Every structure is written in structure tokens, then in C-alpha cells.
Write a protein that binds this DNA or RNA. Sequence first.
RNA 1: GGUGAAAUUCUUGGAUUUAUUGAAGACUAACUACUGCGAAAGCAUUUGCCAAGGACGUUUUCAUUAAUCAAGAACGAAAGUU
Length: 150
Amino acid sequence: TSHCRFYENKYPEIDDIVMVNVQQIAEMGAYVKLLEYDNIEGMILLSELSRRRIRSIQKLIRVGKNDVAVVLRVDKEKGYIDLSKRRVSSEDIIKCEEKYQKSKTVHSILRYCAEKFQIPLEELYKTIAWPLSRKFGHAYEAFKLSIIDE
RNA sequence: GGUGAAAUUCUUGGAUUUAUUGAAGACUAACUACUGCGAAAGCAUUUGCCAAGGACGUUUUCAUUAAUCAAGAACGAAAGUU
Ligand SMILES: [Mg+2]
Ligand SMILES: [Mg+2]
Ligand SMILES: [Mg+2]
Ligand SMILES: [Mg+2]
Ligand SMILES: [Mg+2]
């Protein structure tokens, strides 16, 4: 079960870049799920969805696929996000790519660990990934070190 | 910044705005109007100098010296050329 968000808390921060998989589209916008963080839903509105004039949404969004975005407002009581998509700079997307790729590696490795040990990812992340992220900022550099220095 | 909306561009070597100032070059807002001057272009900050001009007033002076003009000439917006 893929849960237990990458970061040390399940909620977003006010300015961050993130990457999102679209789940559906409504008329006012799309309330979609975050993948840089665990599962929390939030709106992306059509007015702040496309760069150019919004002529089509099917071509741009491509529901079921991965896109870059940022977060502007946060609901820190029960969980709701306001996100943005047009304000992604040419430099933003590159670092979003690298951050999501390292996160995806560290997620798939420990997902395999959970599947082979049949223990929820929450406990495994709390026991292993979190202290390593505390110590060296991200667990992937720790994995590289463990390859080199044990 | 900018735009229908964006992007290019400048920014924690702190831009955008904030106060004093300093430099440069342009130009003369509002007053500015069915208003003025000039042959036409054109002419709008102040002051001085330089000469010029229309209009009016004139019981001033000369007495046709005038009108339009091929040839010839003077100015001639903007742009452009040394
Ligand atoms: Mg300043
Ligand atoms: Mg003036
Ligand atoms: Mg006048
Ligand atoms: Mg002639
Ligand atoms: Mg010239």
C-alpha cells in the first residue's frame, strides 16, 4: 500500500513545486491528487491551468498522466489544496523532474521492501527513511553511501 | 515590467517603488478658443537687442508710379544626403 508521504509531514507548504497525476476534470476545474506528497486532493482551476489560451483541456491535461505544478494556498484542518500550473518557470520543471525521480526511486525501493515483508509502509518509513532524510536531507544519497560506505 | 492574456527583460550584488539632490539633451503641458501673426511652409517659457509688417487715425506728401504675369529669381513641412 503506497501511502505515508515522502516528506516529514503529510501536508504541503506555501510556495513549493510539486508534480501531480490528474484523476478527473470538472467544469470549474480539476480536484486532483498530489504525488510529491501522499494522497491529499486539491483544485487546479482552468484559468490557472494552461499557459496559452485554454482552447482544449483534453490535449493539455491528459488525465492519468504526470504534470508539474505549484501550490498557492493550503487547508491545514482536514486537507485541501489550491494549486497552480501556468506559473511553472522553464527552470522549475527541471528541478521538479529530478526531485520526483529521486523520490520515485526511494519510494519504489521501500514499496518493494513493504511488499516482501507485508508490513505497512508507514512503520517502515518511520523506522528507516525519516532518520536518513533528517541526517542527509534525502535518503538516496544515504543509499549511495551504503553502496560505498556502510 | 507588460499585456486581451502571456512571455522576453531587471532583481536578497537587493531591483520596483522612498526622500533629497547632481548630469545630459529634448521640449515648452495646463492657459489653448469655429482666437492671433505670417507670402506659403510655419510660429506658444521669461528678458534684452536687432531690423521688419499688417490694420486704424491723418484738412500730410508724389501724381498713375498700377493688376496679372512666359524668362528669371527668394523661401519651401517631414523624410533623405555630406
Ligand atoms: Mg531602491
Ligand atoms: Mg507654456
Ligand atoms: Mg492670441
Ligand atoms: Mg514662372
Ligand atoms: Mg532632418
